[PDB]
Enzyme design. Structure first.
Site, short mmCIF file in Angstrom:
data_model
loop_
_atom_site.label_atom_id
_atom_site.label_comp_id
_atom_site.label_asym_id
_atom_site.label_seq_id
_atom_site.Cartn_x
_atom_site.Cartn_y
_atom_site.Cartn_z
N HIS A 20 0.85 -1.22 0.00
CA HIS A 20 0.00 0.00 0.00
C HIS A 20 0.87 1.26 0.00
O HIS A 20 0.75 2.10 0.91
CB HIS A 20 -0.97 -0.03 1.17
CG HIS A 20 -2.07 -1.00 0.97
ND1 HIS A 20 -2.09 -2.21 1.61
CD2 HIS A 20 -3.18 -0.93 0.20
CE1 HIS A 20 -3.20 -2.85 1.27
NE2 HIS A 20 -3.88 -2.09 0.41
N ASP A 32 -5.05 5.75 -1.13
CA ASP A 32 -4.47 5.00 0.02
C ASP A 32 -3.47 5.89 0.77
O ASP A 32 -2.58 5.33 1.48
CB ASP A 32 -3.82 3.69 -0.41
CG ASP A 32 -4.75 2.48 -0.49
OD1 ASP A 32 -5.71 2.39 0.27
OD2 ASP A 32 -4.45 1.59 -1.27
C1 JWJ Z 1 -4.94 -8.29 -5.36
C2 JWJ Z 1 -5.05 -9.29 -4.27
C3 JWJ Z 1 -4.38 -10.55 -4.28
N1 JWJ Z 1 -4.48 -11.46 -3.27
C4 JWJ Z 1 -5.27 -11.20 -2.16
C5 JWJ Z 1 -5.44 -12.22 -1.04
S1 JWJ Z 1 -6.81 -13.36 -1.38
O1 JWJ Z 1 -6.21 -14.00 -2.59
C6 JWJ Z 1 -6.78 -14.69 -0.25
N2 JWJ Z 1 -7.93 -15.22 0.35
C7 JWJ Z 1 -7.49 -16.26 1.18
C8 JWJ Z 1 -8.18 -17.16 2.04
C9 JWJ Z 1 -7.43 -18.08 2.72
C10 JWJ Z 1 -5.99 -18.13 2.61
N3 JWJ Z 1 -5.14 -19.04 3.27
C11 JWJ Z 1 -3.87 -18.83 2.96
S2 JWJ Z 1 -3.61 -17.54 1.83
C12 JWJ Z 1 -5.28 -17.23 1.76
C13 JWJ Z 1 -6.04 -16.30 1.04
N4 JWJ Z 1 -5.64 -15.32 0.13
C14 JWJ Z 1 -5.98 -9.99 -2.08
C15 JWJ Z 1 -6.83 -9.71 -0.90
C16 JWJ Z 1 -5.83 -9.05 -3.14
O2 JWJ Z 1 -6.52 -7.88 -3.05
C17 JWJ Z 1 -6.22 -7.09 -1.88
C18 JWJ Z 1 -5.34 -5.94 -2.33
C19 JWJ Z 1 -7.59 -6.66 -1.38
MG MG Z 2 -7.24 1.19 0.50
ZN ZN Z 3 -5.55 0.60 -2.85
#
Ligand code: JWJ
Ligand code: MG
Ligand code: ZN
EC number: 3.1.4.17
Length: 313
Positions: free
Chosen positions: A68, A107
């Site tokens: 961020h 952000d």
């Molecule tokens: C772009 C992006 C890539 N990856 C993520 C994380 S999401 O993929 C995610 N959901 C889960 C649920 C269980 C879990 N157990 C081990 S790793 C892991 C997870 N990663 C987010 C949240 C994302 O967006 C955030 C910036 C909101």
């Molecule tokens: Mg934000």
């Molecule tokens: Zn953002």
């Protein structure tokens, strides 16, 4: 006035594409943003002296967190630039001005911690703003920077145009609270399907700008696979640090934030693309047909994550 920014040929071409990566040279990011403002908005939208001093104050108020950070700000503004350029006639002059600035600022002063961690920590920002805690902080920081002597890039707008653009920026930044995205997309999905969607309706425009902000904010999932994969390392570095801090408060973090469950990342990514990313770019592609390349990139990346699970990488 007659001073354009000009990029090298590879950047001049690739910057127009949704999947453009802004590269590892921080000192080119300000010029890349100014370039986007000039092509998207005009060379008159902002006094160059005031815009350059706004950009450098915004940069200074982003912290050195793994994800961020100032690079995220510019990346999210580039996705917005790509949406606006591929949808020339759909957006007013005020909206084009406000939205690139909203993305750059969305952000501001992020600490690398979710709204949920602020509330469990009992951080002062959680007492001041009960919901969308960081997002109301980000807008507050944006207004503060606009009010520094020499930093008011909007000074040559009328009183009412000035009130309209700040209101666009506020809604735009609040909409980046992912907790609000789910309901926003359901509503937009219903309105498109029953045929009631109306872009002359301000409350409908707001909702569509909301989804564009979610789409730009998540654009890591719409890059070429090697950018998407290397960005995931930065995302999980923040998440796992937050998980460490939950454990320090005597709270087991959710698996997403527990570095002890690295193994489950590929399966977590699948759920994320299926539950959030794909629905987002799908509903966006329905409302704004020329944003289809983002949906195609996202599906390509879902398929790459499927191959990781299958041990093929
Ligand atoms: C772009 C992006 C890539 N990856 C993520 C994380 S999401 O993929 C995610 N959901 C889960 C649920 C269980 C879990 N157990 C081990 S790793 C892991 C997870 N990663 C987010 C949240 C994302 O967006 C955030 C910036 C909101
Ligand atoms: Mg934000
Ligand atoms: Zn953002």
């Amino acid at each position: 006035g007659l001073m354009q920014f000009t990029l090298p040929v590879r950047l001049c071409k690739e910057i127009e594409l949704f999947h453009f990566d802004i590269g590892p040279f921080e000192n080119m990011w300000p010029g890349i943003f100014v370039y986007m403002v000039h092509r998207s908005c005009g060379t008159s939208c902002f006094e160059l002296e005031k815009l350059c001093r706004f950009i450098m104050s915004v940069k200074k108020n982003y912290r050195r967190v793994p994800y961020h950070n100032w690079k995220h700000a510019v990346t999210v503004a580039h996705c917005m630039y790509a949406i606006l350029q591929n949808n020339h006639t759909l957006f007013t002059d005020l909206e084009r001005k406000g939205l690139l600035i909203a993305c750059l600022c969305h952000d501001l002063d992020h600490r690398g911690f979710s709204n949920s961690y602020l509330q469990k920590f009992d951080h002062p920002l959680a007492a001041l703003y009960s919901t969308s805690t960081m997002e109301q902080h980000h807008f507050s920081q944006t207004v503060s920077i606009l009010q520094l002597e020499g930093h008011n890039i909007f000074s040559t707008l009328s009183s009412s145009e000035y009130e309209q653009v700040l209101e666009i920026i506020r809604k735009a930044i609040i909409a980046t609270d992912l907790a609000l995205y789910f309901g926003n997309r359901k509503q937009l999905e219903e309105m498109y399907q029953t045929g009631s969607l109306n872009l002359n309706n301000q409350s409908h425009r707001d909702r569509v700008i909301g989804l564009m902000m979610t789409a730009c904010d998540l654009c890591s999932v719409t890059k070429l696979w090697p950018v998407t994969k290397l960005t995931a390392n930065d995302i999980y570095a923040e998440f796992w640090a937050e998980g460490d801090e939950m454990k320090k408060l005597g709270i087991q973090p959710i698996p997403m934030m527990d570095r002890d469950k690295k193994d489950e990342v590929p399966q977590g990514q699948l759920g994320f693309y299926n539950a959030v990313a794909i629905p987002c770019y799908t509903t966006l592609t329905q409302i704004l047909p020329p944003t289809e390349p983002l949906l195609k990139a996202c599906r390509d990346n879902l398929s790459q994550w499927e191959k990781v699970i299958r041990g093929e990488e």
